[PDB]
Write an enzyme that holds these catalytic residues in place. Structure first.
Site, mmCIF file in Angstrom:
data_model
loop_
_atom_site.group_PDB
_atom_site.id
_atom_site.type_symbol
_atom_site.label_atom_id
_atom_site.label_comp_id
_atom_site.label_asym_id
_atom_site.label_seq_id
_atom_site.Cartn_x
_atom_site.Cartn_y
_atom_site.Cartn_z
ATOM 1 N N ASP A 135 0.834 -1.194 0.000
ATOM 2 C CA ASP A 135 0.000 0.000 0.000
ATOM 3 C C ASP A 135 0.877 1.256 0.000
ATOM 4 O O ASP A 135 0.678 2.179 0.784
ATOM 5 C CB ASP A 135 -0.947 -0.004 1.199
ATOM 6 C CG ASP A 135 -1.968 1.118 1.127
ATOM 7 O OD1 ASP A 135 -2.388 1.440 -0.004
ATOM 8 O OD2 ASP A 135 -2.357 1.670 2.183
ATOM 9 N N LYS A 137 2.206 4.762 -1.154
ATOM 10 C CA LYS A 137 1.577 5.967 -1.699
ATOM 11 C C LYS A 137 2.129 7.214 -1.026
ATOM 12 O O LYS A 137 2.662 7.150 0.079
ATOM 13 C CB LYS A 137 0.068 5.919 -1.485
ATOM 14 C CG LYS A 137 -0.313 5.473 -0.097
ATOM 15 C CD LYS A 137 -1.799 5.441 0.074
ATOM 16 C CE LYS A 137 -2.158 4.786 1.382
ATOM 17 N NZ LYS A 137 -3.609 4.911 1.661
ATOM 18 N N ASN A 140 1.915 7.611 2.586
ATOM 19 C CA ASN A 140 2.775 6.799 3.439
ATOM 20 C C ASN A 140 4.247 7.212 3.381
ATOM 21 O O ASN A 140 5.064 6.754 4.188
ATOM 22 C CB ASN A 140 2.670 5.338 3.018
ATOM 23 C CG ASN A 140 1.400 4.700 3.477
ATOM 24 O OD1 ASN A 140 0.891 5.019 4.548
ATOM 25 N ND2 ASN A 140 0.860 3.802 2.664
ATOM 26 N N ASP A 153 3.808 2.857 7.765
ATOM 27 C CA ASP A 153 2.585 2.083 7.589
ATOM 28 C C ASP A 153 2.778 0.675 7.017
ATOM 29 O O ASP A 153 2.406 0.408 5.867
ATOM 30 C CB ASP A 153 1.629 2.879 6.702
ATOM 31 C CG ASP A 153 0.308 2.180 6.498
ATOM 32 O OD1 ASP A 153 -0.310 1.750 7.504
ATOM 33 O OD2 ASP A 153 -0.112 2.069 5.328
ATOM 34 N N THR A 171 -4.890 1.498 -1.462
ATOM 35 C CA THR A 171 -5.627 2.614 -2.045
ATOM 36 C C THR A 171 -5.871 2.351 -3.533
ATOM 37 O O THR A 171 -4.973 1.930 -4.260
ATOM 38 C CB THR A 171 -4.863 3.944 -1.880
ATOM 39 O OG1 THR A 171 -4.483 4.104 -0.510
ATOM 40 C CG2 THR A 171 -5.740 5.117 -2.285
HETATM 41 C C1 BI8 Z 1 2.611 14.350 10.403
HETATM 42 N N1 BI8 Z 1 2.436 12.894 10.602
HETATM 43 C C2 BI8 Z 1 3.446 12.061 10.855
HETATM 44 C C3 BI8 Z 1 2.930 10.844 11.015
HETATM 45 C C4 BI8 Z 1 3.774 9.780 11.322
HETATM 46 C C5 BI8 Z 1 3.574 8.427 11.063
HETATM 47 C C6 BI8 Z 1 2.527 7.795 10.395
HETATM 48 C C7 BI8 Z 1 2.041 8.294 9.259
HETATM 49 N N2 BI8 Z 1 1.232 7.371 8.727
HETATM 50 C C8 BI8 Z 1 0.577 7.457 7.412
HETATM 51 C C9 BI8 Z 1 0.128 8.860 6.998
HETATM 52 C C10 BI8 Z 1 -0.980 9.376 7.917
HETATM 53 N N3 BI8 Z 1 -1.539 10.618 7.363
HETATM 54 C C11 BI8 Z 1 1.161 6.269 9.477
HETATM 55 C C12 BI8 Z 1 0.506 5.048 9.351
HETATM 56 C C13 BI8 Z 1 0.694 4.063 10.316
HETATM 57 C C14 BI8 Z 1 1.528 4.310 11.402
HETATM 58 C C15 BI8 Z 1 2.172 5.539 11.527
HETATM 59 C C16 BI8 Z 1 1.993 6.524 10.559
HETATM 60 C C17 BI8 Z 1 4.675 7.745 11.570
HETATM 61 O O1 BI8 Z 1 4.898 6.536 11.513
HETATM 62 N N4 BI8 Z 1 5.469 8.671 12.103
HETATM 63 C C18 BI8 Z 1 4.990 9.908 11.987
HETATM 64 O O2 BI8 Z 1 5.532 10.940 12.382
HETATM 65 C C19 BI8 Z 1 1.554 10.943 10.860
HETATM 66 C C20 BI8 Z 1 0.521 10.015 10.948
HETATM 67 C C21 BI8 Z 1 -0.798 10.416 10.754
HETATM 68 C C22 BI8 Z 1 -1.084 11.748 10.468
HETATM 69 C C23 BI8 Z 1 -0.057 12.682 10.382
HETATM 70 C C24 BI8 Z 1 1.256 12.271 10.584
#
Ligand code: BI8
Length: 285
Positions: A135, A137, A140, A153, A171
């Site tokens: 997944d 993208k 991620n 992710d 997605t």
């Molecule tokens: C600013 N930012 C960093 C994110 C981070 C992470 C994160 C980001 N994603 C996917 C994108 C989420 N929008 C994750 C999916 C599964 C587990 C963690 C995440 C991460 O691993 N470190 C981060 O700093 C994050 C996650 C969600 C929304 C905003 C985010």
């Protein structure tokens, strides 16, 4: 060797919610003793058990523990209280790659090349350990404080052992045809995704767009998309060697003889693959 104390919620000062998921929430937290900021993923055991996600939560944890490369979010620790699970993740200060794509429309040749070279570099490492993201993208692909990428992710990833098993579908705009016609996935699945991403960096939009998911899936299997005029030629060429219905013909796969040919593609002419994360990224136009 002995390990540091098992951490607990009270060792942190939790702050803003970074993002909310269906089965989890990422909260920015600051560790009290050290003052380090970590992005803590939190999940409710009951909810996960109720929804049959133990496989997904265990995998995410396991896959991340195995990772050890500068282009992947690190998993610093884990612990849990009576009702929740906490995953200490590295905090990518500049967020999602997608953010930048929207902020500036499309990327110019230099920025596309550089960042595409990191994704490729990161994919070569991942696949080296027989792991499929499944997944991938712009959502991620995070950007650390230095504007270097950090893929995250991995709960929906898959570990190979034979191209193998199956489960979910990532997605829509990034799904490779094999998942729509075979219910099976392999490394190339990430390659197809790469092709889509590269195309999105250059055109500002992904290759297959439509009113609904059923429609995008319809375009994917028929391979229905086309390049815009100003599309960098070598880039366009690379993308054409990526979005190939036959997954055994995608530049970078095993049958295609690995990452050597892929990194050797004309589009990366001026790329120095050896130390990408120690290079200064080109300012995002
Ligand atoms: C600013 N930012 C960093 C994110 C981070 C992470 C994160 C980001 N994603 C996917 C994108 C989420 N929008 C994750 C999916 C599964 C587990 C963690 C995440 C991460 O691993 N470190 C981060 O700093 C994050 C996650 C969600 C929304 C905003 C985010």
């Amino acid at each position: 060797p002995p390990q540091p104390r098992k951490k607990r919620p009270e060792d942190f000062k939790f702050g803003k919610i970074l993002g909310e998921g269906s089965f989890s929430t990422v909260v920015l937290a600051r560790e009290l003793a050290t003052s380090r900021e970590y992005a803590i993923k939190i999940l409710e055991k009951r909810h996960i058990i109720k929804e049959n996600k133990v496989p997904y939560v265990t995998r995410e944890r396991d896959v991340m523990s195995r990772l050890d490369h500068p282009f992947f979010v690190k998993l610093y620790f884990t612990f849990q209280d009576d009702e929740k699970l906490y995953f200490g993740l590295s905090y990518a200060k500049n967020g999602e790659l997608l953010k930048y794509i929207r902020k500036i429309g499309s990327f110019d040749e230099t920025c596309t090349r550089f960042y595409t070279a990191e994704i490729v570099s990161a994919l070569e490492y991942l696949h080296g350990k027989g792991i499929i993201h499944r997944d991938l993208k712009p959502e991620n692909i995070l950007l650390n404080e230095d504007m270097h990428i950090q893929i995250t992710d991995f709960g929906t990833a898959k570990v190979l052992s034979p191209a193998r098993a199956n489960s979910f579908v990532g997605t829509a705009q990034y799904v490779s045809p094999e998942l729509l016609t075979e219910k099976s996935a392999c490394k190339s699945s990430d390659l197809w995704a790469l092709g889509c991403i590269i195309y999105q960096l250059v055109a500002g939009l992904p290759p297959f767009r439509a009113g609904n998911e059923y429609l995008i899936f319809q375009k994917i299997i028929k391979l229905e998309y086309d390049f815009p005029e100003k599309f960098f030629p070598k880039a366009r060429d690379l993308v054409e060697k990526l979005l190939v219905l036959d997954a055994t013909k995608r530049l970078g796969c095993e049958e295609m003889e690995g990452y050597g040919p892929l990194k050797a593609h004309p589009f990366f002419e001026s790329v120095t693959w050896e130390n990408l994360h120690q290079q200064t990224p080109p300012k995002l136009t």
